[PDB]
Amino acid sequence: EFLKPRLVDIEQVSSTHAKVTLEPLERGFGHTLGNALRRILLSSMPGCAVTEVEIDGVLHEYSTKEGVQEDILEILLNLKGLAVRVQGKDEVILTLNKSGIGPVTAADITHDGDVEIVKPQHVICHLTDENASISMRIKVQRGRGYVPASTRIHSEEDERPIGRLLVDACYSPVERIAYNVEAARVEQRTDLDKLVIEMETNGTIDPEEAIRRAATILAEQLEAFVDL
Amino acid sequence: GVLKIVKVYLAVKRRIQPGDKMAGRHGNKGVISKINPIEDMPYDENGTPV
Amino acid sequence: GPEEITADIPNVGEAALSKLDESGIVYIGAEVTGGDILVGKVTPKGETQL
């Protein structure tokens, strides 16, 4: 009795922007699935950002490093916006080394095989002095939602390493979602609906797999309603 | 009577939470009441929340 | 009598004194929460009369 949809054209502009079409939808199902998908997309999508950073000389985020015009927690704030996608690893640790009077970009990080840098132009910090040395360990892991650094020191159990700068982790790769429901004509079928989801990413997750995992979550939650 | 003093200086970083007083410049006080998910936020036709 | 700043504190675990240094003063950079010991200080009280 009930017609079921599929994903047709997935038109991609920037690496950060995309427009996904969903074409065989019934009346009312454009908006029923559109919102309930926007609600899933924005909130519960796996992705990875940086969790912990060790800086060579620094003892804590409120220090100064001779030869850098950024404060340490300004450098930690730069890393929070580091867009990495890692493959078969759940947590990887990167190594950043650069000296000279150059801005230290995200391309200046040592590249692991499983690691992909989305914004090589991304600015981590600047270097002012000539021979001004900087080297750091940046620990990225995959995660969901928004995990603050405050909630990380409950388990702890000896995270004593006095130079391990814990950073807040905003792991969602979704930045923004909008869905517009317009009528769809597919030869004969008086009125149907074409659902267009438009979404911005940090580059780590691709649009198609995001929607697939978005609706996968949705089917699993309804499993507690398929029966009682 | 005092023989020596040790002063420890603590850098407390305080985010924002229900109870904090906030106001604009026009005499408009207000205490934040619920911290809400980006999804529940009223968004415009563009997808940009508030 | 006089008071000491020694890192030997009565009735606290070895893990309580972990953030403290040898002299009784917490290390620079150590992240702490409420209750944690900043400066281990001990005052004389004799003939407890128990």
Side-chain angles (χ1 to χ4, degrees):
Chain A
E1 190 67 86
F2 272 65
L3 207 168
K4 67 177 86 72
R6 205 190 187 285
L7 66 97
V8 48
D9 198 342
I10 287 166
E11 188 239 333
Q12 195 134 10
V13 196
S14 177
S15 176
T16 86
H17 182 78
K19 303 186 55 180
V20 180
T21 342
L22 283 80
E23 175 89 321
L25 282 153
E26 302 217 288
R27 164 149 65 201
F29 277 159
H31 288 277
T32 284
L33 287 173
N35 174 49
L37 251 208
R38 178 200 186 263
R39 166 66 65 108
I40 294 305
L41 283 167
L42 268 169
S43 67
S44 44
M45 286 294 306
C48 48
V50 13
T51 287
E52 298 160 29
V53 179
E54 215 169 344
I55 317 286
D56 188 25
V58 193
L59 278 312
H60 57 78
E61 12 187 321
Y62 321 88
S63 293
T64 66
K65 187 160 174 63
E66 236 56 26
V68 176
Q69 69 168 344
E70 291 85 325
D71 299 304
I72 302 300
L73 66 148
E74 180 166 348
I75 310 176
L76 296 184
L77 266 40
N78 282 305
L79 297 182
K80 194 193 299 172
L82 183 46
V84 181
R85 47 202 295 188
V86 301
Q87 275 159 86
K89 294 184 174 192
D90 253 318
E91 75 160 68
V92 77
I93 326 177
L94 290 83
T95 163
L96 185 288
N97 305 277
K98 168 74 180 300
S99 72
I101 323 170
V104 183
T105 71
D108 290 8
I109 326 173
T110 296
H111 186 252
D112 187 69
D114 292 290
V115 172
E116 177 187 334
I117 272 72
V118 139
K119 25 185 61 181
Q121 319 98 312
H122 178 37
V123 189
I124 295 176
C125 64
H126 296 175
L127 263 297
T128 171
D129 195 317
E130 314 200 302
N131 53 319
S133 180
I134 116 189
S135 93
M136 71 189 66
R137 293 178 261 252
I138 313 165
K139 191 250 234 183
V140 184
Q141 20 190 19
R142 265 192 306 279
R144 187 159 74 241
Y146 167 75
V147 165
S150 167
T151 64
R152 310 242 220 83
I153 188 184
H154 186 84
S155 32
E156 189 199 277
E157 278 165 321
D158 199 356
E159 79 171 35
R160 203 275 322 172
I162 38 187
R164 270 206 168 277
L165 284 314
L166 274 58
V167 300
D168 295 313
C170 322
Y171 304 112
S172 224
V174 285
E175 189 85 356
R176 154 198 149 114
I177 279 88
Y179 66 99
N180 349 308
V181 179
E182 65 186 276
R185 303 316 179 208
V186 183
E187 189 117 355
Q188 184 60 280
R189 201 46 178 82
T190 56
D191 63 323
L192 287 183
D193 284 339
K194 172 190 328 175
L195 180 49
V196 167
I197 290 90
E198 193 165 323
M199 72 178 52
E200 301 205 51
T201 21
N202 49 16
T204 75
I205 257 316
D206 69 307
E208 189 176 353
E209 189 199 330
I211 294 183
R212 179 158 312 280
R213 182 129 73 239
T216 302
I217 297 171
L218 190 50
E220 224 179 35
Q221 298 286 316
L222 304 166
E223 203 178 352
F225 307 115
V226 182
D227 57 71
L228 299 107
Chain B
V2 52
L3 312 162
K4 60 192 305 192
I5 297 184
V6 179
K7 295 182 177 182
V8 186
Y9 291 67
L10 258 18
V12 184
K13 200 155 62 174
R14 262 168 175 149
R15 282 183 228 77
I16 188 159
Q17 49 150 312
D20 287 1
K21 189 200 248 185
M22 285 187 294
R25 287 163 293 178
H26 314 272
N28 32 335
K29 298 129 71 73
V31 162
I32 149 80
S33 72
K34 179 196 206 57
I35 184 65
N36 227 18
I38 349 94
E39 324 103 55
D40 306 9
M41 284 296 94
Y43 60 94
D44 69 353
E45 36 182 23
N46 233 35
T48 83
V50 61
Chain C
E3 316 179 348
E4 298 184 39
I5 319 285
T6 185
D8 204 66
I9 299 180
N11 305 24
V12 287
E14 194 79 298
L17 317 177
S18 66
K19 359 184 62 168
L20 278 188
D21 87 319
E22 352 126 59
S23 209
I25 281 78
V26 64
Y27 284 92
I28 285 195
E31 290 164 335
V32 294
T33 83
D36 293 7
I37 310 90
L38 289 183
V39 180
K41 182 179 75 74
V42 279
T43 77
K45 176 79 262 291
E47 56 103 47
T48 45
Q49 178 63 22
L50 32 50

